[PDB]
Amino acid sequence: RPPVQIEELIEKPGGIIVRWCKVDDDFTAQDYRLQFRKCTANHFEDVYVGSETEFIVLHIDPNVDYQFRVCARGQEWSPWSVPQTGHSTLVPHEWTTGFEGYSLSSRRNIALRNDAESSGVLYSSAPTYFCGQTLTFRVETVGQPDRRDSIGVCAERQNSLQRDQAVCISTNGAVFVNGKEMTNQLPAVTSGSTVTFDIEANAKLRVTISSNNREVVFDWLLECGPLYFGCSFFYPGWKVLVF
Numbered sequence: 057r058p059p060v061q062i063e064e065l066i067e068k069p070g071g072i073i074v075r076w077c078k079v080d081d082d083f084t085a086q087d088y089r090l091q092f093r094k095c096t097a098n099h100f101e102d103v104y105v106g107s108e109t110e111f112i113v114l115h116i117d118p119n120v121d122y123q124f125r126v127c128a129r130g131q132e133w134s135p136w137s138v139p140q141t142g143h144s145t146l147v148p149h150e151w152t153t154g155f156e157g158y159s160l161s162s163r164r165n166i167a168l169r170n171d172a173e174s175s176g177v178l179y180s181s182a183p184t185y186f187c188g189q190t191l192t193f194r195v196e197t198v199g200q201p202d203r204r205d206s207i208g209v210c211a212e213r214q215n216s217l218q219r220d221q222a223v224c225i226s227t228n229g230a231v232f233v234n235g236k237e238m239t240n241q242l243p244a245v246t247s248g249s250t251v252t253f254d255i256e257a258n259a260k261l262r263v264t265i266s267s268n269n270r271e272v273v274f275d276w277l278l279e280c281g282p283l284y285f286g287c288s289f290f291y292p293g294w295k296v297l298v299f
């Protein structure tokens with residue numbers, strides 16, 4: 057028989073875990089080969105070749121069906137598994153509603169620092185930044201900068217995000233890791249600037265922050281369950297979209 061089949065597809069907000077089963081005990085596997093394609097597309101691409109029986113597929117479009125197949129070697133490759141189609145799950149990124157100092161768009165994904173007083177950080181409505189996602193913000197409008205400005209991700213909704221157990225950028229391009237500024241800076245944000253967060257596997261994560269065609273990579277040590285994101289601006293007029 058074709059010696060391997062896909063046994064589990066674990067669909068998550070930031071990707072898909074594919075796990076396969078050797079379905080013929082008499083086969084001796086040296087290597088496995090996993091391929092994928094968008095169901096809209098007509099060409100498979102290798103994503104994993106190796107001896108493990110699972111692979112975490114990241115950086116796929118939510119909403120979108122992909123098809124996966126796997127074979128094995130143990131020399132020529134074996135016939136393919138039956139294909140299996142999966143998709144990442146959809147959990148939309150939204151700002152908290154009802155937080156004093158911020159006004160939201162209809163779909164709750166654009167926040168504006170208005171003229172009211174504000175308690176502190178405007179957090180995401182829940183911890184919806186998941187392992188494997190690319191989290192993207194865009195600055196729609198600006199106001200006066202202040203070093204209490206931040207945009208970032210953090211482990212708990214705590215009563216700026218320049219503090220422990222968070223990573224964030226300020227509006228001058230400075231980057232903070234658990235409250236401590238890094239040497240390397242990004243360009244200051246202007247209207248139209250995007251800020252992107254990518255994170256890679258206590259716990260040590262390696263964070264890539266990209267903004268205005270520059271990036272900085274560094275290690276983040278926290279105590280990868282889902283994260284909050286947040287923003288804080290001291291002066292009015294700043295407006296940020298999260299994708």
Ligand SMILES: [Hg+2]
Pocket residue numbers: 063077078079
């Ligand atoms: Hg099995």
Ligand SMILES: [Hg+2]
Pocket residue numbers: 063076077078
């Ligand atoms: Hg199995």
Ligand SMILES: [Hg+2]
Pocket residue numbers: 063076077078109
């Ligand atoms: Hg298995």
Ligand SMILES: [Hg+2]
Pocket residue numbers: 095121122123141
């Ligand atoms: Hg399909």
Ligand SMILES: [Hg+2]
Pocket residue numbers: 089126127128133134135136
């Ligand atoms: Hg094959």
Ligand SMILES: [Hg+2]
Pocket residue numbers: 068070071112186187188
């Ligand atoms: Hg993940």
Ligand SMILES: [Hg+2]
Pocket residue numbers: 209210211212213214284
């Ligand atoms: Hg937090």
Ligand SMILES: [Hg+2]
Pocket residue numbers: 206207208209210216217218222223224225286
């Ligand atoms: Hg932050």
Ligand SMILES: [Hg+2]
Pocket residue numbers: 205206207216217218224225226232
């Ligand atoms: Hg910050």
Ligand SMILES: [Hg+2]
Pocket residue numbers: 187280281282283
């Ligand atoms: Hg995490």
Ligand SMILES: [Hg+2]
Pocket residue numbers: 205206207286287288289296
């Ligand atoms: Hg912000």
